[model samples]
Target: LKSVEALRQKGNELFVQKDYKEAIDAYRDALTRLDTLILREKPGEPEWVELDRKNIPLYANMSQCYLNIGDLHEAEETSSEVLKREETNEKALFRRAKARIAAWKLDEAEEDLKLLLRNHPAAASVVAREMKIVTERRAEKKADSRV
Candidate 1:
């Protein structure tokens, strides 16, 4: 746990410095440590809870780093892991939506945005703005295909 915390702190510092690759490496190291213990615990046990707590931040930050690096597939996968851990989490949903946009998976992104907006009405304006961008992109793609 101490080592994981140290790695997480380093990742956070690197993230603040805009060293996304380094930050992701640090976060990935932290996750590697946790993944090693996966077989030792059962779901919903105290062990699982403890690991999940550590995992959430690492996964979320890694997803953020991937997004910053414009690796949409990695970001989408990382954010999906976060969602699997904590379903419908706002941060995970937002990250996944952004990744989907970059991957040109607008429909999936819209579903995530709808879930977010439905659950957190205060985010409606921001989500709506993203929705508009995606809709425009979708239209552009359709027009290009027709041409």
Candidate 2:
């Protein structure tokens, strides 16, 4: 009798408690149930649209949880999945950029930041800060290679 909202709320509560691993499990369970529900609805229908909209935040939250747990690869991949559905998702872009940077995928991090800048120019100040980190990291890598 567990509904998607109920499971999502459970996940949110766990997240607020800083139990990120448990939160991820709850969110994943909710998403699995939601995917099945979405399959029962016809595409472009109101029900389907609502279900799809609900998915974005679940994935976004899960990605954040992965980031909090230091699972950088998982965080990057989860955010990439969100971008596949909503190209302009600001949270996904930002989280993915952070994950990429931590994973040492400097080029990919820059790419995500660039896309974020294009879609939300008002985020330039934040994006600029990330870009600076990318630049410094790249320089550090180059210096390491020379040694």
Candidate 3:
């Protein structure tokens, strides 16, 4: 059987090719193998931590795939899973915010963009644009409410 790393590489190549569905499946295949390894070790053990580390980026990639397919709910769920592993993951945070916006969770999405802008300045130009859209939408809702 191939190693988890090899499967993860395959998934990355698929992702780079923009075959998001198959990439997501390939990542899940890696996740399944990682889960097997994680199950064999106690939580907080070195082996478990290692497996968890391996799990993080696969979930992030899967979240992106979900986003590409317009599966906002699944994207949010997958990104949330990645956040559980590492709260500061920019990829997860960005995807989660995008999904939240798509799902009409404007306030929550704006908050995430704020955090992203604060902590990830390199993404400022992008996250700021989302924040602006969120604000615009919020204002629109308010005007609609007053009418």
Candidate 4:
């Protein structure tokens, strides 16, 4: 389990470094080990079978990699998958919304943001921080168009 944790941590480090391809491999490896770990756990014991919450980071991070690779559909789908198990994932909410915006579904993106804040009131500050980036970029784009 420690090795799996190390592998997953390395994958996250690669992602932070912007090495998407290598990060994908690391994430995949982590998922594999995580699955094995779950299978080895005693059955009939949800407590030890790797709680879904524990998998949130894996799914959310994988969605993020897909988003950066210009695979918006996959990114959104994967994010949705994460939301199924862990509705309060900030990364999943934001990355999925970003992909929706890229697809020109601005209304849907807004809905995602609103839902995100609704589910995780504690994340309101972080949500606002990211939304600021979105608003600033949109304003810049609008100004460029006017020019």
Q: After superposition, how far is residue 147 of candidate 2 from its true place, in Å?
A: 1.8
Off by over 4 Å in 4: 42-44, 48-51, 120-147
Q: At residue 44, what lDDT does model 4 achieve?
A: 49
**Cα-based RMSD of the predictions, in order?**
1.3, 1.9, 1.7, 4.8
Name the better of 1 and 3 by lDDT.
1
TM for every model, in the order presented, reads 0.94, 0.90, 0.90, 0.70
| Global fold similarity of model 3 (TM-score) | 0.90
- Candidate 2 to truth, TM: 0.90
Superposed Cα deviation of residue 128, candidate 4 (Å): 8.1
Q: Name the best candidate (by TM-score).
A: 1
- Each model's lDDT comes to 0.91, 0.92, 0.88, 0.79
> Runs in model 1 with CA error above 4 Å?
42-44
Question: For candidate 2, lDDT tens digit of each residue in 1-147?
Answer: 259999999999999999999999999999999999888999989888877888888888999999999999989888988998899889899999999999999999999999999999998999999999999999999999999
Candidate 1 residue pairs that clash: none
33-66 in candidate 4: lDDT tens per residue?
7777777768748766354455667767888898
Tell me how candidate 1 scores on lDDT. Answer: 0.91
